[PDB]
Amino acid sequence: ASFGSFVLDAGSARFVGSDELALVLGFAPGDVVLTPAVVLAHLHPDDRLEWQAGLQRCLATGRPVVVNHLLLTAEAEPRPAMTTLTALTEQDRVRAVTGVITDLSDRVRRATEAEIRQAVRAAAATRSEIDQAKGIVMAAFDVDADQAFALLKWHSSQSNRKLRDLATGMIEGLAAANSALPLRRRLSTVFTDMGCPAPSTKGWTVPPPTSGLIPTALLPGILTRAAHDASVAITVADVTAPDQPLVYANPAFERLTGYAAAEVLGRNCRFLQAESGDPHERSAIRSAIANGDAVTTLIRNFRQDGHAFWNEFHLSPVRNGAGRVTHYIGYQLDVTERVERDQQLEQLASLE
Amino acid sequence: ASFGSFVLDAGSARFVGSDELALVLGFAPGDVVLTPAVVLAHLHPDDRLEWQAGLQRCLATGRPVVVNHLLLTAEAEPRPAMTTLTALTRVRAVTGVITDLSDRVRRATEAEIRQAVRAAAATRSEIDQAKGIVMAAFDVDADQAFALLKWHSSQSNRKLRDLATGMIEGLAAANSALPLRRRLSTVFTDMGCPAPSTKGWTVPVTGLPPTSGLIPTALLPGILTRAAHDASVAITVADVTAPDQPLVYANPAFERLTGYAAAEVLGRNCRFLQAESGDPHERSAIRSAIANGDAVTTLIRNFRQDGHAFWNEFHLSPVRNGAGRVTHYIGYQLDVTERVERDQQLEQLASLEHHHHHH
Numbered sequence: 265a266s267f268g269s270f271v272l273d274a275g276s277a278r279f280v281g282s283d284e285l286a287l288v289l290g291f292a293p294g295d296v297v298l299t300p301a302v303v304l305a306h307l308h309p310d311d312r313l314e315w316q317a318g319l320q321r322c323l324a325t326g327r328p329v330v331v332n333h334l335l336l337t338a339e340a341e342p343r344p345a346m347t348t349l350t351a352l353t354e355q356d357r358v359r360a361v362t363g364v365i366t367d368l369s370d371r372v373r374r375a376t377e378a379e380i381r382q383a384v385r386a387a388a389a390t391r392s393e394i395d396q397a398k399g400i401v402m403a404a405f406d407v408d409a410d411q412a413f414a415l416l417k418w419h420s421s422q423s424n425r426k427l428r429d430l431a432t433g434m435i436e437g438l439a440a441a442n443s444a445l446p447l448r449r450r451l452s453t454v455f456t457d458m459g460c461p462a463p464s465t466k467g468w469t470v471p472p473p474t475s476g477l478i479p480t481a482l483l484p485g486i487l488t489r490a491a492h493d494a495s496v497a498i499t500v501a502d503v504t505a506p507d508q509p510l511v512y513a514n515p516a517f518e519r520l521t522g523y524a525a526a527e528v529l530g531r532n533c534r535f536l537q538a539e540s541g542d543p544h545e546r547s548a549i550r551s552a553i554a555n556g557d558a559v560t561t562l563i564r565n566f567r568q569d570g571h572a573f574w575n576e577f578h579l580s581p582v583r584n585g586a587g588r589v590t591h592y593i594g595y596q597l598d599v600t601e602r603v604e605r606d607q608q609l610e611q612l613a614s615l616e
Numbered sequence: 617a618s619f620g621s622f623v624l625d626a627g628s629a630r631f632v633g634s635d636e637l638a639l640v641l642g643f644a645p646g647d648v649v650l651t652p653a654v655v656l657a658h659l660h661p662d663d664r665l666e667w668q669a670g671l672q673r674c675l676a677t678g679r680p681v682v683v684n685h686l687l688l689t690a691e692a693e694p695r696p697a698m699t700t701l702t703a704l705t706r707v708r709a710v711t712g713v714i715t716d717l718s719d720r721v722r723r724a725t726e727a728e729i730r731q732a733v734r735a736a737a738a739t740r741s742e743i744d745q746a747k748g749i750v751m752a753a754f755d756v757d758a759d760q761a762f763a764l765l766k767w768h769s770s771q772s773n774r775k776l777r778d779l780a781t782g783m784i785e786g787l788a789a790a791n792s793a794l795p796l797r798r799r800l801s802t803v804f805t806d807m808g809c810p811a812p813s814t815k816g817w818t819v820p821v822t823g824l825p826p827t828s829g830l831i832p833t834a835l836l837p838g839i840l841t842r843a844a845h846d847a848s849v850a851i852t853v854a855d856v857t858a859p860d861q862p863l864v865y866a867n868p869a870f871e872r873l874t875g876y877a878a879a880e881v882l883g884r885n886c887r888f889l890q891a892e893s894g895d896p897h898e899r900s901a902i903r904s905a906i907a908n909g910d911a912v913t914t915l916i917r918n919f920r921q922d923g924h925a926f927w928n929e930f931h932l933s934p935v936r937n938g939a940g941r942v943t944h945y946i947g948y949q950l951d952v953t954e955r956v957e958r959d960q961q962l963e964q965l966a967s968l969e970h971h972h973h974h975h
């Protein structure tokens with residue numbers, strides 16, 4: 265049960281296994297004729313080449329051999345085992361080899377809970393925190409793990425930083441970042457603070473019966489109050505006047521842009537661009553307004569302070585009783601977070 | 617594998633020990649003459665009797681023998697060892713193989729620990745990933761994210777590592793159409809965490825009077841009618857002079873938000889968004905504010921025409937005619953689900969903090 269024995273004759277290859285050998289392997293003594301192939305069968309496949317070689321060398325050299333290996337069990341886990349081999353030399357020639365397979369299970373020393381905890385914590389102290397960085401990126405841009413992984417690799421190349429170095433830098437960079445900024449824009453600044461290229465700034469320009477249940481007399485006060493209280497920016501420009509000046513700006517516009525409604529009347533809305541308006545973008549807007557068509561524009565803008573943001577503003581033409589388009593309505597929206605995410609997908613697409 | 621061998625002639629008791637046997641015991645081959653008495657001197661007293669018997673047994677029987685024992689080390693703890701004895705056939709001599717199991721035993725222990733570390737390293741990576749997912753999904757720091765993972769592990773009676781795996785697998789399988797915070801919240805509840813709260817509130821409004829700027833007063837109705845029509849947020853008007861405060865205006869942004877066409881809601885009170893599930897106290901708060909001509913903001917649970925729910929923060933602004941009579945009310949509905957979902961997670965952490973401070 266603990267150990268078994270066999271003998272092989274060099275000349276005739278006659279293998280005689282003992283009753284104990286079958287028992288150490290998981291057999292009854294008489295069940296099977298014990299053979300070397302059967303012995304190898306109950307060894308872990310990693311042990312079979314060395315075990316065979318150990319025997320062949322004992323036959324060729326006659327010196328004793330010891331092989332460390334496992335013993336497979338049909339149901340249970342493998343047990344540590346050892347095989348010793350010795351030879352009988354007749355006239356400087358090996359006549360037979362006797363082998364002894366022993367079960368080392370009773371000599372195994374198991375790992376204490378303490379040393380395991382020490383080793384696990386040592387590894388946990390030296391780990392790369394990319395898994396956390398992976399989770400932050402996937403959730404921040406609502407992308408999957410693979411996509412989040414791909415982005416982190418790209419960002420490292422641009423920063424010329426180790427992949428793990430990017431993970432730590434991003435995490436402690438995000439932690440010290442300004443919480444008042446939205447997350448996606450916060451993360452992009454963390455990446456640019458580490459040498460990654462700033463995101464692109466290019467934009468684009470693309471193109472009521474009446475219920476009668478409101479008294480005509482009461483409509484102006486109702487509609488005036490509605491524009492005042494609306495949570496999105498509303499503006500009106502007199503396209504008949506010099507330089508298409510603004511004639512209305514609601515409080516939401518002040519909040520969005522930092523310019524007080526009073527101190528903006530009479531001016532063209534270009535001022536939101538500071539002195540950084542792109543010429544090609546201006547031509548698209550100017551051409552749209554002159555043509556009296558309805559259009560939507562994505563553009564970068566700036567508040568009365570330096571704070572930049574993406575602005576998707578829609579332009580609606582309004583006619584008078586004569587059918588002449590005399591005013592335009594502008595609907596400004598801060599769409600920074602959508603654009604930040606969409607730019608990351610552009611980046612992933614570019615990796616095709 | 618460090619081992620040594622010997623051969624012992626039966627009749628003459630001649631003992632031939634290998635150079636390797638000398639080294640196993642702790643001597644260069646030339647330093648010592650190898651005799652059976654020398655071998656036993658490096659075994660522990662308690663092994664000597666069993667070892668001698670095994671050697672005598674293999675001689676008489678000729679049957680293989682194995683003896684477990686120690687090897688004594690000068691100024692060091694003994695090493696585990698094992699002797700194998702085979703006879704060369706009567707018994708002409710016995711071949712012995714003394715093996716030092718010190719290395720094999722040490723490596724097996726080291727391997728068990730390595731496998732353990734790999735298991736722990738895997739469980740740490742998933743917790744770290746889930747920690748990061750929570751951090752950015754709800755925009756909270758790592759301690760808060762980790763605290764919420766511990767909280768939701770407690771509420772679902774799960775171990776933190778099992779929760780982490782469930783959240784990652786579940787989120788991956790969630791419906792991509794749901795905005796992330798709603799999506800993740802339903803993953804926690806699908807795993808046994810209790811459902812989020814449903815109770816809202818109603819508060820007053822804490823400005824400057826409205827003006828129409830420099831819009832020509834004649835063009836104002838057309839200009840601002842167009843404005844309310846194209847605005848991206850919902851706008852509704854109710855006539856509080858008519859019975860049951862019916863809806864008299866609703867812009868397309870309201871139609872997108874609720875799934876109701878204006879034609880099919882004009883003339884009805886807005887309560888239909890509550891789907892007959894309005895909290896009695898919340899309704900009374902709204903009624904009282906309206907009856908008093910107050911400006912209030914209300915958070916309430918609502919449902920589109922298709923039944924799907926959303927958190928609605930809608931502001932109520934009274935409109936007074938020339939004589940000062942409130943004739944209409946304006947409502948601005950906003951889907952603030954994602955914000956509310958974050959506030960609720962933050963609310964769970966703040967509730968725990970208060971508990972720790974005051975118990």
Ligand SMILES: Cc1cc2nc3c(=O)[nH]c(=O)nc-3n(C[C@H](O)[C@H](O)[C@H](O)COP(=O)(O)O)c2cc1C
Binds near residue numbers: 534537549575579
């Ligand atoms: C009602 C209205 C609102 C506008 N709002 C914005 C805006 O928010 N941001 C912006 O960059 N341009 C806006 N524009 C465009 C500018 O006012 C300007 O007409 C356009 O950029 C062309 O500028 P240019 O005359 O310098 O080429 C708006 C135009 C109108 C008519």
Ligand SMILES: Cc1cc2nc3c(=O)[nH]c(=O)nc-3n(C[C@H](O)[C@H](O)[C@H](O)COP(=O)(O)O)c2cc1C
Binds near residue numbers: 852
């Ligand atoms: C302009 C306006 C908009 C409203 N919008 C909503 C809404 O979107 N969701 C909601 O639950 N209640 C809304 N209400 C409140 C209900 O229509 C109703 O006044 C309230 O539930 C009163 O309680 P009762 O229905 O029990 O009388 C609104 C009220 C007004 C005047």
